[PDB]
Write a protein that binds this DNA or RNA. Structure first.
Ligand SMILES: [Mg+2]
Ligand SMILES: [Mg+2]
Ligand SMILES: [Mg+2]
Ligand SMILES: [Mg+2]
Ligand SMILES: [Mg+2]
Lengths: 143, 110, 52, 48, 95, 92, 354, 49
RNA sequence: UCGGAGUACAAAAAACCCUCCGAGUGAUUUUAAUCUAGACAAACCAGUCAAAAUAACCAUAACAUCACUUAUUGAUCCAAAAU
């Protein structure tokens, strides 16, 4: 035969990002006495300080994967009034960009009822949508 | 007589699987009249407030910070009246999943 | 006050029935229920009075 | 003939459905607004 | 139960059993749940389902029903179209 | 597939498009059935599969309708890799 | 029977005496914050983090880096303060703010980010995707030099490879354009590795494209050790990850050991351990640039296996473990009839002697 | 069972095989009293037949 | 007969013509589907949860809610209904 033809029956895929992209991996179902839902591969987290707006994308490990902050000199220097609605929109656009660049198209966003009504965050979500990142992750397969 | 009908059997509320046990998906971990143990990772809550495993694995109990759902009035009020350093803790049940999600097998070599 | 057990019928033309407890002094009951044969959410109107 | 009768009945009444449930929805909404208008026209006549 | 009949001197069957149970050939008996037709409006969907089941009897009951029933009801039957023919044998039972 | 004359040329070409996944590097189309313990039933399943493939390929009226259930990921990740691909300067 | 707490109890600090004089958070949100901070501390009791795999927890990081750029703190601070004074000064800007009309020149932000904190973000993305775990095994480096890789999809089309992004093997059929900034006394080495998708060896990877002794920014001028081989995942397995590594080397290094034949379509010839390869040349080579992408099987790949590697094409499935059933009982009690079907071998009647 | 019966020459394939032939080879047993309406043919040995 | 608290101090169970409260339902609309891994509970009968999968609906839309929620209930046969 061919020395190339050797395969082995069970293929090992070491890539941690894999099963998530395939949608076949395990989310964490559970909690549901508490809040927010911990069920997701990726979660958008928006922290608003009295000064800066910080948008993180998290993995259930707690590990921050890709983020955009207003403390960041790149964003800080271009625009004005770090705490403004404007800033939220901005950070949203930046984050969408970096997300696409990172290969993650899906994340969950779980705001508070009053953060849902707020303009800054509505426009953050808008910015994130036009950026091509979909909130509301795809379902699991054989969940 | 004055006193009547005190007689009813025990409901057998308790905790069915214990820390370190092996479980299969759907096993009831505990059952309770009020929340004593809260459901943690991979643990579903029943409508009768009982906890059951959603994944095959090992049961673990844990203490953790409790951050109630903002749709729940009572709990938010309780949290809001706390002194500024304080943090509510509760007891949780998890299942650490054992089997890998699935494997990759060689179907056919074309 | 007493309640009443009424038989409720689909307007989907499918014969299908489900019984409901309804207030005696109230109006004739009308609901949107699930009909299994048509597999839809349809309108049910009370046909008959079963139990009192 | 029985099967075709059943199917006929079902198609006939399934064609009539959106009209029926919409009509009943308007009926109930009109009922609600009738009762609320009654309670407001009573509230203002009691206030005066 | 009549162990020795009068005319034939044989052992009679208790028909009241034959009406409510079903004997598979393996020795498993099958029964309906109790109260499954009773007061349905008052019950949960889930409970209704739990009632609509066909269920198996524990060993004790099985031996009891066997004793209450003659040999004829234990024969291997082949019915045309029979729903239950699928279930008569037992498979992979390691005991 | 190429050497099979009992099927028309347009059909023989469309088959090599839709089913190229199950085609072999030696040019072989390969069907497989599993279910029954009786290989009569298996053979019958294969032959019925083949009949159906030839049937849908010989129909020009086939619109190849795709569901959005498992393809939503595909469309969105496609579009979103097309946002990056959009950089225009010639290379090589 | 009471035991004694080991270390501090959580709320033992605040005074219960005189609750009315204590400040409370009347905000749900303040509470949420304080709680999430509390959930990040290393407690002495069994916790979620403990069981659910913080992944080695505390880890002392062997760092093979390029030394961080030396910049004056105070000077930089002054300049930035000034810039922000100037920017805040304008009335035009404030008008842009109140009326909710403003835009950020994204390209410039991307440039600044690439220049400043980019290396760290790219680093933690690499950590996330386990680049470091499969390459140097323990080792983290910050990608000091930005690496710009792109593919030609056509005449006017350019497909960039950012860290972690997805690319189709069709796009990658040709060797990519590579760009980074260095003057020339310089020597570099570029490496393209398929981290998974080695068929025989779970711990080993494939070298696709290895180039060496690279003067300055000049890509083609360097001698190619291993000629470019297009990405070839396998049909079943999803998303293999490819890694572009950039090493800054001092001495010219020559390896006849690592050199491969010109066509090199044998798989046993491209088998690679980034670890070992780095151990060898460790003294001269310091890893600098990094960019990597996610890639799944697509049509074009079929052509590879047949045409280049002279192979049959392996296809995989995703197989889930068979469902767990309890030991079968002789008299299943109070169990639905369908019980007997769970232990059924195959659905087909079998008439034993009949 | 039919094949096994022919192989050992209990029923002979030469002449036509009906119920009486199956009974006479004791390949099968019918008891009409139990409402047996006859033999039915099943496919268990199809591949080997 | 059924439920809650004590008796029964921390898994379960646990008696008295023991100590105390209750239940034999309201009110409301969110009218709450089918099917099935695995379990709780258990002498038996009865009770309980429940993933995945279907179908319903935003077009990846299945826990009726409140009253301490726990209890608001009754087997076979047999009768009435016709589905
Ligand atoms: Mg008691
Ligand atoms: Mg008792
Ligand atoms: Mg016989
Ligand atoms: Mg038990
Ligand atoms: Mg479900």
């Amino acid at each position: 035969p061919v020395e190339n033809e050797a395969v082995a029956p069970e293929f090992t895929n070491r890539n941690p990002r894999n099963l998530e992209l395939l949608a076949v991996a395990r989310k964490e179902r559970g909690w549901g006495t508490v809040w927010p839902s911990r069920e997701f591969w990726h979660r958008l987290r928006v922290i608003r300080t009295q000064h800066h707006i910080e948008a993180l994308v998290e993995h259930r490990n707690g590990q921050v994967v890709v983020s955009a902050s207003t403390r960041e000199w790149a964003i800080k220097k271009h625009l004005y009034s770090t705490r403004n609605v404007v800033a939220c929109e901005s950070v949203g656009r930046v984050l969408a960009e970096r997300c696409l660049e990172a290969g993650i198209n899906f994340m969950v966003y779980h705001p508070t009822p009053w953060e849902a009504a707020s303009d800054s965050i509505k426009r953050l979500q808008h910015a994130m949508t036009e950026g091509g990142v979909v909130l509301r992750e795809p379902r699991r397969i054989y969940e | 007589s004055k006193n009547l009908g005190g007689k009813s059997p025990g409901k057998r509320f308790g905790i069915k699987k214990m820390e370190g046990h092996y479980v299969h998906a759907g096993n009831i971990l505990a059952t309770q009249r009020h929340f004593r143990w809260h459901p943690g990772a991979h643990v579903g809550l029943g409508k009768n407030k009982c906890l059951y495993a959603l994944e095959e694995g090992v049961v673990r109990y844990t203490k953790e910070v409790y951050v109630p759902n903002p749709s729940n009035s009572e709990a938010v009020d309780l949290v809001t009246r706390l002194p500024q350093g304080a943090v509510l803790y509760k007891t949780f049940v998890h299942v650490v999943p054992a089997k890998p999600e699935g494997t990759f097998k060689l179907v056919a070599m074309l | 006050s007493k309640t009443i057990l009424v038989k409720m019928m689909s307007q989907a033309g499918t014969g299908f029935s489900f019984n409901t407890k309804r207030s005696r002094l109230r109006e004739k009951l009308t609901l949107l229920h699930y009909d299994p044969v048509v597999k839809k959410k349809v309108l049910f109107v009370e046909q008959k009075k079963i139990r009192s | 003939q029985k099967r075709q009768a059943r199917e006929q009945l079902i198609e006939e009444c399934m064609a009539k459905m959106p009209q029926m449930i919409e009509n009943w929805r308007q009926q109930q909404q009109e009922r609600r607004e009738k009762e609320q208008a009654d309670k407001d026209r009573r509230a203002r006549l009691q206030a005066e | 139960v009549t162990y020795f009949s009068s005319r034939k001197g044989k052992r009679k069957t208790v028909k009241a059993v034959i009406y409510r149970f079903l004997r598979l050939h393996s020795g498993l008996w099958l029964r309906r749940k109790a109260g499954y037709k009773k007061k349905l409006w008052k019950k949960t969907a889930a409970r209704k389902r739990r009632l609509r089941e066909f269920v198996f009897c524990n060993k004790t009951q099985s031996k009891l029903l066997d004793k209450m029933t003659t040999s004829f009801w234990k024969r291997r039957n082949w019915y045309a179209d029979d729903p239950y023919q699928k279930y008569q044998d037992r498979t992979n039972l390691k005991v | 597939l190429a050497s099979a004359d009992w099927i028309a040329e347009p059909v023989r070409l469309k088959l090599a498009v839709k089913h190229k996944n199950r085609i072999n590097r030696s040019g072989e189309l390969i069907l497989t059935s599993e279910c029954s313990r009786y290989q009569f039933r298996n053979l019958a399943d294969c032959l019925q599969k083949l009949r159906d493939m030839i049937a849908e390929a010989s129909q020009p009226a086939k619109e190849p309708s795709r569901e959005d259930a498992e393809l939503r990921r595909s469309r969105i990740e496609n579009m979103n890799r097309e946002r990056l691909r959009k950089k225009r300067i010639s290379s090589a | 029977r009471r035991a004694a707490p080991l270390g501090p109890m959580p709320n033992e600090d605040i005074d219960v005496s005189d609750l009315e004089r204590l400040k409370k958070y009347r905000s749900f949100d303040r509470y949420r914050r304080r709680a999430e901070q509390e959930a990040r501390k290393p407690h002495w009791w069994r916790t979620y983090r403990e069981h659910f795999g913080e992944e080695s927890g505390p880890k002392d990081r062997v760092d093979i880096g390029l030394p961080p750029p030396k910049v004056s703190r105070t000077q930089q601070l002054l300049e930035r303060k000034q810039a922000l004074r100037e920017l805040r000064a304008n009335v035009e800007e404030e008008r842009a703010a109140r009326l909710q009309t403003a835009r950020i020149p994204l390209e410039a932000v991307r440039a600044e980010w690439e220049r400043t904190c980019g290396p760290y973000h790219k680093q933690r993305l690499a950590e996330y995707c386990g680049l470091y775990r499969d390459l140097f095994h323990g080792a983290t480096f910050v990608p000091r030099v930005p690496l710009h890789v792109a593919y030609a999809v056509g005449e006017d089309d350019l497909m960039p490879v950012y860290h972690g992004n997805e690319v189709t093997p069709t796009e990658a059929a040709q060797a990519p354009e590579v760009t980074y900034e260095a003057d020339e006394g310089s020597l570099w080495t570029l490496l393209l590795t398929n981290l998974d998708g080695h068929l025989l060896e779970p711990d080993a990877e494939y070298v696709h494209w290895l180039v060496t002794n690279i003067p300055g920014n000049r890509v083609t001028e360097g001698q190619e050790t291993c000629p470019y081989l297009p990405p070839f995942p396998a049909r079943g397995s999803g998303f293999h990850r490819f890694a572009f590594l950039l090493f800054k080397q001092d001495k010219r290094i020559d390896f006849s050991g690592d050199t491969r034949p010109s066509p090199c379509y044998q798989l046993a010839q491209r088998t690679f351990h980034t670890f070992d390869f780095y151990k060898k040349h460790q003294d001269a080579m310091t890893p600098a640039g990094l960019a990597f992408f996610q890639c799944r099987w697509d049509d074009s790949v079929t052509r590879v296996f047949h045409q280049l590697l002279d192979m049959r094409e392996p296809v995989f499935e995703f197989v889930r473990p068979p469902p767990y059933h309890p030991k079968q009982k002789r008299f299943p009690h109070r169990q639905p009839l369908r019980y007997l079907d769970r232990y059924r071998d195959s659905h087909e009647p079998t008439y034993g002697i009949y | 069972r039919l094949q096994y019966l022919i192989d050992l020459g209990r029923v002979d394939p030469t002449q036509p095989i009906d119920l009486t032939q199956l009974v006479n080879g004791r390949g099968v047993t019918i008891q009409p009293s139990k409402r047996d309406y006859g033999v039915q043919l099943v496919e268990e040995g199809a591949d080997t037949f």
